[PDB]
Amino acid sequence: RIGGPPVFMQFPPPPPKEYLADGTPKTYPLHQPVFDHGYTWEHWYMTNAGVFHTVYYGEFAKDFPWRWGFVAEKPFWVGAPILVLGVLCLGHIIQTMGQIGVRPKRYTPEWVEATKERERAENT
């Protein structure tokens, strides 16, 4: 249809580049920080790149914060079992905070014996 929305249009040229007074090129905000830490590992993974191709994808330590650079440096089966135990221990500790020193009477020895008497009478 003549005059309809074109099926293809060429991009117009980008706006003029900006230079500072001294001639330095102007920089713009960029959310790709260079985290500061001592880790320099580089992990590479063969990745599917369609059906007939792959790509060797690399992860660099300097692109991650300190916490991940520290964890990702260690062998997985060294850190993993420690984390599993640590997380479980923390969960138990957190929930134990709210019941420090709570001593219900129904868990005392006297009450425990009485339940045994009831079970014997009722043949539970």
Binding site: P15, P16, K17, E18, Y19, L20, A21, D22, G23, T24, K26, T27, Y28, P29, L30, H31, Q32, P33, V34, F35, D36, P65, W66, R67
Partner: protein, 52 residues
Amino acid sequence: GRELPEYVVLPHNQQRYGRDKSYSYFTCLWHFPKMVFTEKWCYTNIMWFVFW
């Protein structure tokens, strides 16, 4: 039809923007409140919303 140059030299010489500085896990705890109480466009919008 408009004619533009390939580049333009700005009058000032300040490099205001660039790569973001390295940050920690809790960097947001102080940066976010700083923006609210220190950026003009932030608290002006808040006051405008609250007032009306």
